[PDB]
Design an enzyme around this catalytic site. Structure first.
Site, mmCIF file in Angstrom:
data_model
loop_
_atom_site.group_PDB
_atom_site.id
_atom_site.type_symbol
_atom_site.label_atom_id
_atom_site.label_comp_id
_atom_site.label_asym_id
_atom_site.label_seq_id
_atom_site.Cartn_x
_atom_site.Cartn_y
_atom_site.Cartn_z
ATOM 1 N N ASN A 1 -8.891 5.412 3.081
ATOM 2 C CA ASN A 1 -9.619 6.224 2.097
ATOM 3 C C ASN A 1 -10.594 7.225 2.774
ATOM 4 O O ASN A 1 -11.320 6.897 3.675
ATOM 5 C CB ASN A 1 -10.214 5.224 1.065
ATOM 6 C CG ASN A 1 -11.662 4.939 1.284
ATOM 7 O OD1 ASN A 1 -12.466 5.823 1.609
ATOM 8 N ND2 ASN A 1 -12.003 3.668 1.210
ATOM 9 N N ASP B 1 -15.538 -4.536 9.791
ATOM 10 C CA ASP B 1 -16.824 -4.119 9.265
ATOM 11 C C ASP B 1 -17.548 -5.209 8.485
ATOM 12 O O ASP B 1 -18.620 -4.932 8.016
ATOM 13 C CB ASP B 1 -16.725 -2.864 8.404
ATOM 14 C CG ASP B 1 -16.109 -3.117 7.053
ATOM 15 O OD1 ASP B 1 -15.920 -4.292 6.634
ATOM 16 O OD2 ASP B 1 -15.763 -2.104 6.396
ATOM 17 N N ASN C 1 -7.659 8.877 -5.667
ATOM 18 C CA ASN C 1 -8.405 7.826 -6.317
ATOM 19 C C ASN C 1 -9.123 8.473 -7.493
ATOM 20 O O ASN C 1 -9.301 9.682 -7.519
ATOM 21 C CB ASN C 1 -9.407 7.163 -5.343
ATOM 22 C CG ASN C 1 -8.725 6.427 -4.178
ATOM 23 O OD1 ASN C 1 -9.042 6.647 -2.965
ATOM 24 N ND2 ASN C 1 -7.794 5.597 -4.503
ATOM 25 N N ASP D 1 -6.430 8.245 -0.516
ATOM 26 C CA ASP D 1 -5.892 7.282 0.428
ATOM 27 C C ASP D 1 -4.656 7.834 1.166
ATOM 28 O O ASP D 1 -3.799 8.462 0.542
ATOM 29 C CB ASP D 1 -5.465 6.044 -0.310
ATOM 30 C CG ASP D 1 -6.612 5.267 -0.900
ATOM 31 O OD1 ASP D 1 -7.822 5.588 -0.787
ATOM 32 O OD2 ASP D 1 -6.295 4.204 -1.432
ATOM 33 N N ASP E 1 -12.277 8.411 -8.256
ATOM 34 C CA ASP E 1 -13.495 9.040 -7.763
ATOM 35 C C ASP E 1 -13.277 10.394 -7.081
ATOM 36 O O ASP E 1 -14.249 11.012 -6.735
ATOM 37 C CB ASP E 1 -14.287 8.073 -6.832
ATOM 38 C CG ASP E 1 -13.732 7.990 -5.354
ATOM 39 O OD1 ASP E 1 -12.537 8.240 -5.088
ATOM 40 O OD2 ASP E 1 -14.543 7.678 -4.431
ATOM 41 N N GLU F 1 0.795 -1.224 0.000
ATOM 42 C CA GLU F 1 0.000 0.000 0.000
ATOM 43 C C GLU F 1 0.836 1.287 0.000
ATOM 44 O O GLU F 1 0.455 2.229 -0.664
ATOM 45 C CB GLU F 1 -0.908 0.013 1.236
ATOM 46 C CG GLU F 1 -2.020 -1.008 1.178
ATOM 47 C CD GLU F 1 -3.083 -0.707 0.147
ATOM 48 O OE1 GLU F 1 -3.010 0.329 -0.535
ATOM 49 O OE2 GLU F 1 -3.998 -1.521 0.043
ATOM 50 N N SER G 1 -11.718 10.808 -4.060
ATOM 51 C CA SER G 1 -11.258 10.527 -2.710
ATOM 52 C C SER G 1 -9.690 10.324 -2.690
ATOM 53 O O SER G 1 -9.004 10.285 -3.720
ATOM 54 C CB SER G 1 -11.985 9.351 -2.122
ATOM 55 O OG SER G 1 -11.686 8.169 -2.830
HETATM 56 O O1 LIG Z 1 6.325 -2.706 -3.252
HETATM 57 C C1 LIG Z 1 6.925 -1.438 -3.311
HETATM 58 C C2 LIG Z 1 6.336 -0.659 -4.470
HETATM 59 C C3 LIG Z 1 5.373 0.366 -3.954
HETATM 60 C C4 LIG Z 1 5.706 1.715 -3.889
HETATM 61 C C5 LIG Z 1 4.770 2.606 -3.436
HETATM 62 C C6 LIG Z 1 3.580 2.212 -2.949
HETATM 63 C C7 LIG Z 1 3.270 0.887 -2.983
HETATM 64 C C8 LIG Z 1 4.142 -0.023 -3.496
#
Ligand SMILES: OCCc1ccccc1
Ligand SMILES: OCCc1ccccc1
Ligand SMILES: [Cl-]
Ligand SMILES: [Cl-]
Ligand SMILES: [Cl-]
Ligand code: NA
Length: 129
Positions: free
Chosen positions: A59, A101, A46, A52, A48, A35, A50
């Site tokens: 989000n 949730d 995103n 993250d 839409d 992430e 929004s």
């Molecule tokens: O897996 C590292 C690559 C990556 C960079 C930035 C955000 C998510 C993934």
């Protein structure tokens, strides 16, 4: 702040994520890796409108307030900028609510697509915990 792997596992563990709702620690670390690359300052917009935020890319559509996602909710009752602190507490508490949730960790698209059904324990292998 960019956490190291073991360093984040330890923080997540101290914050009560180990086996939280049945998700072992490796799941959270793997999620965090894909992430945000372990960067507490990660933001991504995103399609839409929004955004993250933070280490678990929480989000603004549902979970936090950023003042610019029309018709969104703030279910964690926090500003999205609290999800960007070097202290992961707010991202953690907000994650606990999300994961409880009904969808479990499937809420995090990268967990479903990159961690789910993999040997996630590898992500905490060799860490002092
Ligand atoms: O897996 C590292 C690559 C990556 C960079 C930035 C955000 C998510 C993934
Ligand atoms: O050994 C470091 C963590 C890691 C786990 C699984 C796949 C790549 C890296
Ligand atoms: Cl694990
Ligand atoms: Cl808003
Ligand atoms: Cl579940
Ligand atoms: Na919001």
């Amino acid at each position: 702040k960019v956490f190291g792997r073991c360093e984040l596992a330890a923080a997540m563990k101290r914050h009560g994520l180990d086996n939280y709702r049945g998700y072992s620690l490796g799941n959270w670390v793997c999620a965090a890796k894909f992430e945000s690359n372990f960067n507490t300052q990660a933001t991504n917009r995103n399609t839409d409108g929004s955004t993250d935020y933070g280490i678990l890319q929480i989000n603004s559509r549902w979970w936090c307030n950023d003042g610019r996602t029309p018709g969104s909710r703030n279910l964690c009752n926090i500003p999205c900028s609290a999800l960007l602190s070097s202290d992961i507490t707010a991202s953690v508490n907000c994650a606990k609510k999300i994961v409880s949730d009904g969808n479990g960790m499937n809420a995090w698209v990268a967990w479903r697509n990159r961690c789910k059904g993999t040997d996630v324990q590898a992500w905490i292998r060799g860490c002092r915990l």
